[PDB]
Amino acid sequence: MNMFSSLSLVTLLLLTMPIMMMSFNTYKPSNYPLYVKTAISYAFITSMIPTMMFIHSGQELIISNWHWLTIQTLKLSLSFKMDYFSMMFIPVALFVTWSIMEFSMWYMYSDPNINKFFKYLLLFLITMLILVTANNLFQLFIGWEGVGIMSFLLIGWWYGRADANTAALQAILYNRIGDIGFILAMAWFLTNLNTWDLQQIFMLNPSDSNMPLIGLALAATGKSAQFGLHPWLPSAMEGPTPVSALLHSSTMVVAGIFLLIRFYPLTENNKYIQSITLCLGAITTLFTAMCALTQNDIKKIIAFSTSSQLGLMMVTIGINQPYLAFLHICTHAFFKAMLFMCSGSIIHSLNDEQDIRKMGGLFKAMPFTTTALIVGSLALTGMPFLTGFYSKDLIIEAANTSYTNAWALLMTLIATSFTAIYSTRIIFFALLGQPRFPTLVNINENNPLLINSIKRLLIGSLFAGYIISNNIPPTTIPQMTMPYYLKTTALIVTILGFILALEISNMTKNLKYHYPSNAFKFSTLLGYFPTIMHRLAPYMNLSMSQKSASSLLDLIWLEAILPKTISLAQMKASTLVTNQKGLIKLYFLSFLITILISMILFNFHE
Amino acid sequence: MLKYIIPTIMLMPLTWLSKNNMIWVNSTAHSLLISFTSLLLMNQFGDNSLNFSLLFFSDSLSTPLLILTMWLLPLMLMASQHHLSKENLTRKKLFITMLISLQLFLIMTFTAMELILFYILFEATLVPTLIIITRWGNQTERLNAGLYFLFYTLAGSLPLLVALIYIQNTVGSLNFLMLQYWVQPVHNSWSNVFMWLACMMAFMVKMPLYGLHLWLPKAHVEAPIAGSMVLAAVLLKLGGYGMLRITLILNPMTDFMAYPFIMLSLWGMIMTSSICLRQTDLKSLIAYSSVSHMALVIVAILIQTPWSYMGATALMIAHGLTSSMLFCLANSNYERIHSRTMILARGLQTLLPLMATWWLLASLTNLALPPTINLIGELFVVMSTFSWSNITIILMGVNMVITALYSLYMLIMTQRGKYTYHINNISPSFTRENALMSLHILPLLLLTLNPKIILGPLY
Amino acid sequence: RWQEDPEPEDENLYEKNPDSHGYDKDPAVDIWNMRVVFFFGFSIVLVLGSTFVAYLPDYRMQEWARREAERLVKYREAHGLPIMESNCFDPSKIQLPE
């Protein structure tokens, strides 16, 4: 407990030292990026020791080291829960961040503010680890909104670009709408259970937990970009490719799924929440994969893939399989970060070109980027015994052997086929066929930083899934008896998608011209949701702000019915009082009237 | 309180007897020394307030407000001495005298044990405030702004004077300690309905309450920077502090008299947040931001719960430093381009990189990023209003979203994008401007490490 | 119209004093103004004040209340009494109406 507790804290204290050295101007500004990269590598080592101890005996502990504030009967302490979910996620996140930071050292080399970029990447990770280890809801909320702000500053990295500022603000807008549910969950838990600590919530085990869990689902919807609050993640592609790698594999978008996993003691007893999340994930996984089939920006395809994979994790939550959802979080981190890094390798070599229609013929020109891209694609589509097979395959077989909504199961399977189709698109258009890029060839993937960073994630995408599944303890009853056709549903729908995707890709070569179908336009324009909603909602709210809130009320009616009416009445009365003839005759004639009414009307003489 | 009142008065001889070129150095240095000694007021006890004499006492509510007030005086001096450089020497000393006299009235207002002593000082702050706005404002409209500020306040205060004197007649005392033990319940009647209104309308106008807030954007847009700093940081909190004290004797009538004002605040906060999205004037945007934030304080004071009173106390302190910082940030732009139009000068993060950091930090506190005390105050209020009625989370949620939109819109419009080509007098930020910004944000962020000292008497 | 002075130009404090801190036109006064703001503002109020606040003695007796509660729980549980009774005041000292 001395070694376990000491080591799991240095991991967090280690990551903050580069922040401390930076903001205290005691560092060596020469190669700060390598310093920040080195710190992350060492923190991965120190975080493996507590993980091995958990793997060995299941050792878990809580550390409440500092008493921050007591609000009557609510004590708030800085607490860190080093449990199952924290001990597996921390080394995985650090391992992937280790590769991304090394990759960023080559990708961001020419950026003049590369030192600030690595500082933000480090804060992005620190706020994620605060989120993951938080033992009470307030400390968790610090990490919750920290990743949101760090995401805002990194998406809008190129702040002279209007499109990057719109994307950065859009991410805050959608995530804050999600944060309404988080605040709702906090308010319910404080009111009904008198706590924010995860321990007391689970011990009291509320039965009427519909309201708090709907709040948590709403929060997860924003952070994980489920249907209704989804557009911001594809738009978050404005940021530099290293941001996309870290934003999508770890840090932000996974926090939504992680929040629901942390609360599975409540959700496992509430069937109503399970039905909602299952449907919420199913539409999300289907819709976003449907949008990827026609995207031409290589980063937007991978961005839509993440939304589709997050929808799958939300489905896993919906079927009362929190640990499979967690496993998918871990395995997904490896090959999704690699895919983004492989696309960055292509984009860099093609002078900032991101449209797959303008690539091609890179299969041999970029051999190592091609191998990683194929491995990443096969891992994503659940190829047997690659890292993505150990989470995704189990999820599907649990999905079709469960008491489930029949539509959500059918949507999930079709989206699994769509995963093969858009994976085929990237390979077919980026790597195969004849080159379609400009004539001045500058392809070059020979930087060791690029090669090593991808090489580490490539090994992870091959064995990390196998290693983890064989080391994690079992916390459920895995379903292994089932009909042959339910066992192989994931594999067959994937193969069929590959075959069909290949036929569709080949038809582009034929000398035929076809008018687009309404379905084709619907997929390309993302179901018109960004088009309609990002013009209608801003227009109505902004127009009401000026027309009614400001002018009609504040500049007119609130002025009219008080200061402007009162001051006009006084001005009128002043004129009546003072507009006199200065005639002795009239003044004394009014004295007679005053005296007469004094006696006759008011009897002042009695 | 004489260990603070007297040295505050001695700032006036110091300023007038200083060498012509040392008025700012001397007044700034010695007002910082007074700020240092104000920390001795944090000798607070769990059960009893700190009662010095028959005239003055200091509990956990007034102590943080006193410390905010005395910290603000040096900051206001730093913020003014640039635009007052060409001023006549005597008119510079008279300006400083108005600020010192405002601090004097303020620290006595927050520690008066008797409510009629509180009323006089509460009213006395008008004169120095009005003179600052109308004498040292820059625009024609500063004269109208002075009148709106004066007559909005007096319209409410004069009824309060009648109510307090009536209360002293019937109860026999207005000493706040005595009221705690001699308080009797207020029973329904039209007579008490108007006693309740007279006791609360003067403070509602100062907050301000939505609907009665029109004086505030006028005053801010016309006041000099130092006037805007004290107006937002402290003078608004005279409404909150007064309400937190007087509600003691308004029970249980506050149960139903609160409804019209909770409705105005809950809806008003969404309306004034949305107004910020379409403001063209940077100072006016910040003014309307205060109305939205102070709406939460009004709701929290009126629902009368231990959590809501803790939240209101933290919100008042957090808002004081943040809104004062935002006015100072906008002013530094104004001293360069001499306009308050938000869209006029864009992309300033390219030209003033470090001032863009301050803009970021100020915005993050304004949207209540956890664990800032801005978030602690706003969160505690939201927890208590949820228990008051669950549906309030809808209005609280929307306000949080709109608050983020206009906070980052202000950041993005002024600091990001492309710089305006024809504007070529954006000089590098002065040390004075950077130190002014840091003296706002550093204490504000430091208080997160130890938030109990700004949580008020119910902590 | 009238006989009026034209609007004077903008003075950039950096032109005459490239080392200006923005406080005063006189460089010696400008340096002193900076020194008092930084020494008294940061070195004293913020650093010492922060240290003073951190070591405040049991602000509002929160620690004593925790020590006292421990004493009571230890006593009551040993003697078999309720940890806390619903009645704040001894009911024998109260005289209900009716």
Binding site: - | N138, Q139 | R1, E7
Partner: peptide
């Protein structure tokens, strides 16, 4: 700019027989 001060048009508001 610089601080606004009353000009002749403003001053003539107070030079009439009545306000």
């Amino acid at each position: 700019a610089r601080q606004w001060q009353p000009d002749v048009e403003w001053a003539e508001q107070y030079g009439g027989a009545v306000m």
